[PDB]
A paper describes a structure:
S-6p bound to GW01 exhibits a conformation with two “up” RBDs (two RBD monomers are shown in orange and light blue) and one “down” RBD (gray), among which the two “up” RBDs are bound by GW01, whereas the “down” RBD is not. GW01 targets the lateral side of the RBD, which is highly conserved between SARS-CoV-2 and SARS-CoV. When aligned with the ACE2-binding site on RBD, we found only one overlapped residue, Gly502, between ACE2 and GW01. However, this was sufficient to allow competition between GW01 and ACE2 for binding to the RBD of the SARS-CoV-2 S protein. The interface between RBD and GW01 consists mainly of a hydrophilic interaction network and can be divided into three clusters. RBD-Lys378 represents an important docking site that can form salt bridges with Asp106 of GW01-H and Glu111 of GW01-L and forms an H-bond with Asn109 of GW01-H. RBD-Tyr369 can also form hydrogen bonds with Asn52 and Lys67 of GW01-L and might be stabilized by Tyr110 of 4A8-H and Phe377 of RBD via π–π interactions. Furthermore, the main chain of Val503 and Gly504 of the RBD can be stabilized by Asp31 and Tyr102 of GW01-H through H-bonds. We mapped the key residues that affected the neutralizing activities of GW01 by site-directed mutagenesis and found that the F374A, K378A, R408I, P463A, and G504N mutants greatly decreased the neutralization activities of GW01. Therefore, GW01 targets a conserved epitope shared by many different sarbecoviruses, resulting in extraordinary breadth for this NAb.
Author numbering:
A (entry chain A): 27 to 67, 81 to 143, 153 to 172, 187 to 247, 264 to 621, 640 to 676, 690 to 691
B (entry chain H): 2 to 229
C (entry chain L): 2 to 212
């Protein structure tokens, strides 16, 4: 079952005395006329932000609550109990029965089975309300005990709840339960939200009445005036603001295809020891289209996934290219050993680009053997990352400098691959392209294809036109820019037209319907009905009597054909009255 | 272009085995090889890979340290040595060829597994081996319906999985249906093979089930007749 | 490293059926997928490598998609020979090949057959053998979602029963079997037992009484 609170769950926000003073507060309250669960006699509930909790009986079936996140061991929880003696607050790590309770001989307490690591102890019909909240490691408890003249139904009325306890625990809470005394020989749960209330203080300092300032237009007016009686008139109470849904973002097509099509499709690559190195500049490089050219044999990157490179941007891209064996592709990797990855190429350990490699046995190898690819094997030291050595000096191995004539312990530094088409993979020619990116300080270079969503119209939207960020309704235009102008401005300098980069059409930008909200009341001493004016808003975009005026959209009043003396002035010749009531 | 395997059988937990796989139709220095196991009725589970061109091996994590794998291109073979088995290794084992060698670790983007073997069954346990116990399930009116009635033979409680029951030395092929053996909690298998035959022919002709257990040497013929 | 995929998919013969896989970042992030078809009993076939490349011999009804971290087979038009398991593979930088969970196919063509049930009590020699086994055979029930429950004189029983998974016959319908273990004194204890089978809501039961 569910039930309706009426005006319930008001607590004194803090100490500090006070008398007749319609004082205004912002806090966590139980909104007026709320949807409170009903329980009879129970299960694990949430907490999520404070709790209202009433209960009704003459016996005592409700014997405290249990709180926490897991209601077991492995994390801490609170336990608040009351046998026929008195209250027992306690904070340990427990092991709670999934259905914990206490009996009524009169032997009881099948509640838990563990009391480890206790960090806090304490020991020592009817309507009993409680408000539980938990802020900054303090667990606050307000309470009130009113006598009903019923037995177990939620009554109506006003009664403010006075603070009881304060516990500096530190405990996290996400769930709570209840405890009941069995048979061996009715309760509600509200939740609290951040509201703003207007409390009326007595001359002794007690809260006697309140106003929830977000219930209806009358209450928002009472809050705006800081009173409990509004006299006839018309009052500005707040503001409206048509919210914008979605948000398009469309840039221009792609010009500089960014020519990978000759670094991957060149007729003749470089050898490895004098490896090629291209530098790419300002272009539109689509990495996913490069990814599925559908012939590769290694596509591996370390700094970044390839598909999420389609929405970054860099300053400079280096693309090295060469040709090596089959069994040496494992050397083109960060932190390797072996000739290649130590003689004709070295990667740094914090690499970021993609290594790409594929087979080209049918193109670079030939019967008799293509011997035109040279690789270095002799060097007096290792190499830096991205170093390059194109010299051809005669290396001396031994102690004897031999001076330009080879023989024992001095050799030529370069050998040649013999690429024969009757070879197994492991001596076959593989072509290798290594990318690397850098972001030094440069203004703008190669970026990706900024996903340009579809352009919508006639809806308050959040838009971006290749840099122009804004909000508003977009509409087909009938102005004519000059064919180099992107957007138009008004006097007082606000963007009011744009040109769509892709289709090149002019679109006006009008703001989102906004304005004030006014409440028309005959006075609370006459009635509590209300009418509402949305000022200069078209009455079709507001969220009976909906009536359109030159002054806005009026809701809650009927339009008649008579004409009286003016009572409450709306505007543009229109007045309102409480006559025909309504 | 063919893949055969050998080496399976039954060992107790704690033993060891040597699986082998022989290939035909290509060289071994252009392809990597995989051992992939599969429990009966369940999905696949990769066990190990060796690259072509020598050695760079990898095992699955649950089989780490216990197993070993090598190849021999002098003989065109794979060896998978299994040590200290556990009871969760009862599976078929498949010898698969990976085109474009190099562990999938280095040669990304194109590995595949194109041609497969026929697999080899391996099961472990202490139940040892045992012979089947046979009963005849008589044709009855509770099995009879109109023109036909069913009779069969129940062969139960045996470990050594391959067992066969024929009807009349292989004569009747109509209605003869042997159902998949069932594995009990006791650890032994059991099955029942049944055949329908016209109800006018309850006892008339010969219906003798020939039970043969090949790992053992059990051969028994049991006649099935209507209930007394 | 788990490669979550649905356990079974369905569809009428003659339209497009998709099959998805979802791996995280070391699986499908920086690697490629394969797809493998396993007809019942045989060795698995290769279907798609390098996310969309069928090899020679795969017909032009299978495709392949890889989007960021998900993958998808797309069978364009089912037929009577595509009722199999389908697995997706990856590599996982974790240093271990991972496999999918598999997905059956359920052409859902054959009409709804009736599970023919047949029950047998323990034979006489088994009674003399100090044991007893009830035998419940199910056959010809083309849609294979059968389940079984066993009954002593009035109550259900849940101990001593073994149930085969359904197995496909030649006529491409299914068959199954279940066994009940009993001591002969319990066999004569209760006046009768029964095997009931439920199948698409429908139910058929058989019953036998000791002599
Ligand atoms: C940007 O690219 C789009 C396509 O990606 C171009 O679109 C076409 O626009 C013309 C209008 O002049 C149509 O007649 C064509 O049918 C469109 N093609 C398609 C496939 O829809 C667009 O023209 C490009 N931008 C510019 C300024 O040319
Ligand atoms: C190298 O050249 C080939 C041949 O032209 C390009 O392959 C084309 O790729 C596109 C992309 O899908 C296909 O639509 C064409 O059909 C392919 N061509 C042929 C003849 O089939 C390839 O794109 C080029 N390499 C790069 C990196 O662009
Ligand atoms: C409370 O919310 C539930 C949610 O479905 C609804 O069914 C019920 O009518 C609501 N009660 C009141 C009083 O609005
Ligand atoms: C009431 O419960 C508390 C919980 O520990 C216990 O300490 C106390 O002894 C109980 N009362 C009596 C009379 O035992
Ligand atoms: C909490 O209790 C557990 C088990 O009794 C123990 O291991 C742990 O040390 C305790 N916590 C502290 C802070 O001692
Ligand atoms: C409560 O739980 C949150 C979980 O988001 C955790 O971050 C926080 O540290 C916990 N509270 C304390 C005091 O540790
Ligand atoms: C409390 O308020 C009442 C009415 O507002 C007043 O009559 C009384 O004097 C005040 N003080 C008390 C009851 O001590
Ligand atoms: C205001 O209320 C008082 C008493 O309730 C009444 O006498 C008076 O007429 C009211 N004023 C108006 C304008 O209705
Ligand atoms: C409100 O919008 C509708 C729809 O375009 C229009 O017909 C109507 O005239 C607008 N309101 C006013 C006051 O013009
Ligand atoms: C007011 O008078 C006009 C005369 O043109 C008529 O059309 C309209 O319906 C009348 N309004 C009402 C509410 O009767």
């Amino acid at each position: 079952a569910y039930t309706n609170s009426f005006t319930r769950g008001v607590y004194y926000p803090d100490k500090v005395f006070r008398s007749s003073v319609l004082h205004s507060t912002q806090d966590l309250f139980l909104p007026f006329f709320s949807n409170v669960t009903w329980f009879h006699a129970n299960p694990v509930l949430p907490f999520n932000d404070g709790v209202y909790f009433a209960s009704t009986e003459k016996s005592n079936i409700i014997r405290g609550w249990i709180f926490g996140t897991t209601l077991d061991s492995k994390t801490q929880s609170l336990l608040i109990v009351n046998n026929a003696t008195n209250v027992v607050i306690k904070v340990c790590e427990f092991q709670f029965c999934n259905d914990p309770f206490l009996g009524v001989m009169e032997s009881e307490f099948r509640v838990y089975s563990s009391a480890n690591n206790c960090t806090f102890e304490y020991v020592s019909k009817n309507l009993r309300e409680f408000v539980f909240k938990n802020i900054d490691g303090y667990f606050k408890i307000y309470s009130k005990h009113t006598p009903i003249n019923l037995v177990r139904d939620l009554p109506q009325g006003f009664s403010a709840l006075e603070p009881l306890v304060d516990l500096p625990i530190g405990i996290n809470i996400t769930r709570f339960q209840t405890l009941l005394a069995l048979h061996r020989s009715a309760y509600y749960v509200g939740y609290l939200q951040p509201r703003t209330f207007l409390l009326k203080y007595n001359e002794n300092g007690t809260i006697t009445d309140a106003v929830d300032c977000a219930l209806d237009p009358l209450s928002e007016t009472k809050c705006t005036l800081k009173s409990f009686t509004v006299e006839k008139g018309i009052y500005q109470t707040s503001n409206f603001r048509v919210q914008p849904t979605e948000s398009i973002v469309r840039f221009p097509n792609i010009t500089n295809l960014c020519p990978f099509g000759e670094v991957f499709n060149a007729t003749r690559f470089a050898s490895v020891y004098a490896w090629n190195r291209k530098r790419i500049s300002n272009c539109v490089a689509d990495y996913s289209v490069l990814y599925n050219s559908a012939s590769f044999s290694t596509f591996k990157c370390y700094g970044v996934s390839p598909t999420k490179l389609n929405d970054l941007c860099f300053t400079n891209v280096y693309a090295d290219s060469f040709v090596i064996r089959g069994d040496e592709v494992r050397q083109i990797a960060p932190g390797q050993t072996g000739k290649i990855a130590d003689y004709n190429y070295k990667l740094p350990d914090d690499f970021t680009g993609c290594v790409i490699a594929w087979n080209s046995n049918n193109l670079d190898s030939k019967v008799g053997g293509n011997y035109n690819y040279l690789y270095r094997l002799f060097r007096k030291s290792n190499l830096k990352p991205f170093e390059r050595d194109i010299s051809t000096e005669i290396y001396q191995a031994g102690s004897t400098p031999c001076n330009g004539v080879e023989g024992f312990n001095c050799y030529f530094p370069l050998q040649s691959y013999g690429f024969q088409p009757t070879n197994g993979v492991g001596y076959q020619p593989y072509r290798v392209v290594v990318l690397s990116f850098e972001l030094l300080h440069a203004p703008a270079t190669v970026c990706g294809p900024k996903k340009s969503t579809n352009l919508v119209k006639n809806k308050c939207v959040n838009f971006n036109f290749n840099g122009l960020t804004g909000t508003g309704v977009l509409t087909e235009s009938n102005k004519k820019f000059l064919p180099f102008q992107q957007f138009g401005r008004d006097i007082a300098d606000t963007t009011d037209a744009v040109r769509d980069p892709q289709t090149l059409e002019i679109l006006d930008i009008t703001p989102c319907s906004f304005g004030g909200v006014s409440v028309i009341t005959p006075g609370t001493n006459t009635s509590n009905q209300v009418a509402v004016l949305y000022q200069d808003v078209n009455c079709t975009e507001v969220p009976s009597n909906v009536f359109q005026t030159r002054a806005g959209c009026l809701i809650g009043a009927e339009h008649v054909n008579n004409s009286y003396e003016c009572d409450i002035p709306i505007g543009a010749g229109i007045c309102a009255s409480y006559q025909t009531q309504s | 272009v063919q893949l055969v395997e050998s080496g399976g059988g039954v060992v107790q937990p704690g033993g060891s085995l040597r699986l082998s796989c022989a290939a035909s139709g290509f060289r071994f220095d252009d392809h990597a090889m995989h051992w992939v196991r599969q429990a009966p009725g369940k999905g696949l589970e990769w066990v190990s890979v060796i690259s072509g061109d020598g050695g760079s091996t990898y095992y699955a994590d649950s089989v780490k340290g216990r197993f070993s794998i090598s190849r021999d291109d002098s003989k065109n073979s794979l060896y998978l040595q299994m040590n200290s088995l556990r009871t969760e290794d009862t599976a078929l084992y498949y010898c698969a060829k990976d085109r474009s060698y190099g562990p999938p670790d280095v040669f990304n983007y194109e590995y595949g597994m194109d041609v497969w073997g026929q697999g080899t069954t391996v099961t472990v346990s202490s139940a040892s081996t045992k012979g089947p116990s046979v009963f005849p399930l008589a044709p009855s009116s509770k099995s009879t319906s109109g023109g036909t009635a069913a009779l069969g033979c129940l062969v139960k409680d045996y470990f050594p999985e391959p067992v066969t029951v024929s009807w009349n030395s292989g004569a009747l092929t109509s209605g003869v249906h042997t159902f998949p053996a069932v594995l009990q909690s006791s650890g032994l298998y059991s099955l029942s093979s049944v055949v329908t035959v016209p109800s006018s022919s309850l006892g008339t002709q010969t219906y003798i089930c020939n039970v043969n257990h090949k790992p053992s040497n059990t051969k028994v013929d049991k006649k099935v007749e209507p209930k007394s | 490293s788990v490669l979550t995929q649905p356990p079974s998919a369905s569809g009428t013969p003659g339209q497009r059926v998709t099959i998805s896989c979802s791996g995280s970042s070391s699986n499908i992030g920086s690697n490629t997928v394969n797809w493998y078809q396993q007809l019942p009993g045989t060795a698995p076939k290769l279907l798609i490598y390098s996310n969309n490349q069928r090899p020679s011999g795969v017909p032009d009804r299978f495709s392949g998609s890889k989007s960021g971290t998900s993958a998808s087979l797309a069978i364009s038009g089912l037929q009577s020979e595509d009722e199999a398991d389908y697995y997706c593979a990856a590599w996982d930088d974790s240093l271990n090949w991972v496999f999918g969970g598999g997905t059956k196919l359920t052409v859902l063509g054959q009409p709804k057959a009736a599970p023919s049930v047949t029950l047998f009590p323990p034979s006489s020699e088994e009674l003399q053998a100090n044991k007893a086994t009830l035998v419940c055979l199910i056959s010809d029930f083309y849609p294979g979602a059968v389940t079984v429950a066993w009954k002593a004189d009035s109550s259900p029983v849940k101990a001593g029963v073994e149930t085969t998974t359904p197995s496909k016959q030649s006529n491409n319908k299914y068959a199954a079997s279940s066994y009940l273990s009993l001591t002969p004194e319990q066999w004569k204890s209760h006046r009768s037992y029964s095997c009931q089978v439920t199948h698409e809501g429908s139910t058929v039961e058989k019953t036998v009484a000791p002599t």
